[PDB]
Amino acid sequence: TGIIMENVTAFWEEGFGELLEKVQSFSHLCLVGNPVLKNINLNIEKGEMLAITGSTGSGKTSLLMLILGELEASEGIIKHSGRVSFCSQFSWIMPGTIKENIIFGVSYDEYRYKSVVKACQLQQDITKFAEQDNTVLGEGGVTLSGGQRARISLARAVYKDADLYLLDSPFGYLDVFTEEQVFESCVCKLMANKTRILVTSKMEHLRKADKILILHQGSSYFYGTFSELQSLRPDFSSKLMGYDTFDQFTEERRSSILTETLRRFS
Numbered sequence: 001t002g003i004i005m006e007n008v009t010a011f012w013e014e015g016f017g018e019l020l021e022k023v024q025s026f027s028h029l030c031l032v033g034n035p036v037l038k039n040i041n042l043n044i045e046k047g048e049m050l051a052i053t054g055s056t057g058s059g060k061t062s063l064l065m066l067i068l069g070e071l072e073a074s075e076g077i078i079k080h081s082g083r084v085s086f087c088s089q090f091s092w093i094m095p096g097t098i099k100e101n102i103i104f105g106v107s108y109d110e111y112r113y114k115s116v117v118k119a120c121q122l123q124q125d126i127t128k129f130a131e132q133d134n135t136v137l138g139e140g141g142v143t144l145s146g147g148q149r150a151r152i153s154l155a156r157a158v159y160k161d162a163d164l165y166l167l168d169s170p171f172g173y174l175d176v177f178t179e180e181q182v183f184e185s186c187v188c189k190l191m192a193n194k195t196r197i198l199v200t201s202k203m204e205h206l207r208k209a210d211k212i213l214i215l216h217q218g219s220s221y222f223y224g225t226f227s228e229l230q231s232l233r234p235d236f237s238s239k240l241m242g243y244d245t246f247d248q249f250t251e252e253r254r255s256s257i258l259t260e261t262l263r264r265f266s
């Protein structure tokens, strides 16, 4: 499946801020009648990758909830059909082995498993443990690094057979060379033909995306190709492409540069 949004708007409604909270004054935002997103348009073909970036708290997560149906479109048309698979920014971990976490509630299939494991770069993790992917974890799997938890929860989501993959900021940790190999192997090759939406703050991901959506304040700052971006948003581009290794700054620096840049160039 592809995905289409034509001129979609969505309001704060009772309970969405708390959902937002799990997944990453609400009353007043529902009382007053307020768009969390306004005039969103995107059109994404089967098998393409949409990269979503923007300033912090611009509605990135919220756009995924709307896809998931947890937020409601008060206006506009959304089309997409099929199973969706959601990897949240929170990396949840269930009691059981690493392997049991990746296949959680889904049947085991060897070729599929081994291939997901290799492309999420889990082979370098599990090889440090005496029982490898049979190692037992407690929930939160709290002695692992953030990147280890995020790769296991990415592998779980990519292993789900679905028509659309929603991946909310997996690449936000310090082990930055691993993240680059995950993006190239999992998101770019293994998933090359699965429709997919990657929320992100690395410019390489916009560079390889089929489509790009930049959000600011609940609003679409830009939407189209990386090439259209360089030509239609030149102040944004020149500033962002003008660092020499932006993608290796910490997630917080990158997101703060993005926010400031989006603030400057509205």
Ligand SMILES: Nc1ncnc2c1ncn2[C@@H]1O[C@H](COP(=O)(O)OP(=O)(O)O)[C@@H](O)[C@H]1O
Pocket (backbone or CB within 6 Å): 017, 020, 021, 024, 036, 054, 055, 056, 057, 058, 059, 060, 061, 062, 063
């Ligand atoms: N944990 C939170 N507590 C209070 N307000 C929040 C929280 N998370 C997001 N918001 C607010 O809700 C709106 C939408 O946030 P969100 O969709 O999470 O943006 P983003 O994913 O781009 O960082 C923003 O206006 C933001 O300030």
